[PDB]
Design a protein around this ligand. Sequence first.
Ligand SMILES: CC(C)(C)OC(=O)N[C@H]1CCCCC/C=C\[C@@H]2C[C@@]2(C(=O)NS(=O)(=O)C2CC2)NC(=O)[C@@H]2C[C@@H](OC(=O)n3cc4cccc(F)c4c3)CN2C1=O
Ligand SMILES: [Zn+2]
Length: 200
Amino acid sequence: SHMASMKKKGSVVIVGRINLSGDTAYAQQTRGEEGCQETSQTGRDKNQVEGEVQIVSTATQTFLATSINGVLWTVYHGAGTRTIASPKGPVTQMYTNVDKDLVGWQAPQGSRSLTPCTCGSSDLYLVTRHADVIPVRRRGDSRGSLLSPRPISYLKGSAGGPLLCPAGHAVGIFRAAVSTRGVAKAVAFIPVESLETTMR
Ligand SMILES: CC(C)(C)OC(=O)N[C@H]1CCCCC/C=C\[C@@H]2C[C@@]2(C(=O)NS(=O)(=O)C2CC2)NC(=O)[C@@H]2C[C@@H](OC(=O)n3cc4cccc(F)c4c3)CN2C1=O
Ligand SMILES: [Zn+2]
């Protein structure tokens, strides 16, 4: 092909967060669309990062990314092999596993990391991009059922978000919804143990 005109993929850009610091969970936007587009091109993001759950965007998709053990994790089906924007330019993935639908980068300065759960509890909570905290009963290694099913529309854009135990530890990263007639009855997630193995 004409090699001189081949384009490069933009970086993933942090565009907001899910604030879990207080008694009320809520989404905050930290960058609008024009800034996002420019930042994706340059890979240079000088915005302050805070919190555990980031809202992230590419040119075509928006989803979540969650810091656990000093790594910002998200789904491969959202990020592909993309770099993430940072104050000093694009940062290359430190983990990539298409078979797990998993990617990770070093956690941004200013972020806070969730602690991996060792409670062995099956009472979980899924945090969505709209800051809904959805009770989920763990049903296996990588699945849980919604206590209150809802349309898949409500979950779209939340891949990369956490499933948490009652004590607020990370149990997994949301990757897929299990649905019947458009209603999500269950969720599939990357268990935190699988993240911990990937880190080895
Ligand atoms: C796996 C099973 C049981 C057959 O189910 C499903 O395939 N179901 C569907 C239902 C889709 C309807 C919307 C559901 C709403 C929210 C879904 C959470 C979500 C999302 O919000 N993405 S996103 O908008 O943020 C997006 C911007 C990031 N993910 C998806 O859509 C994913 C993406 C795609 O799956 C994968 O490419 N892989 C690769 C995997 C490798 C290993 C293990 C896996 F499981 C893998 C899943 C299909 N997906 C589903 O969920
Ligand atoms: Zn726990």
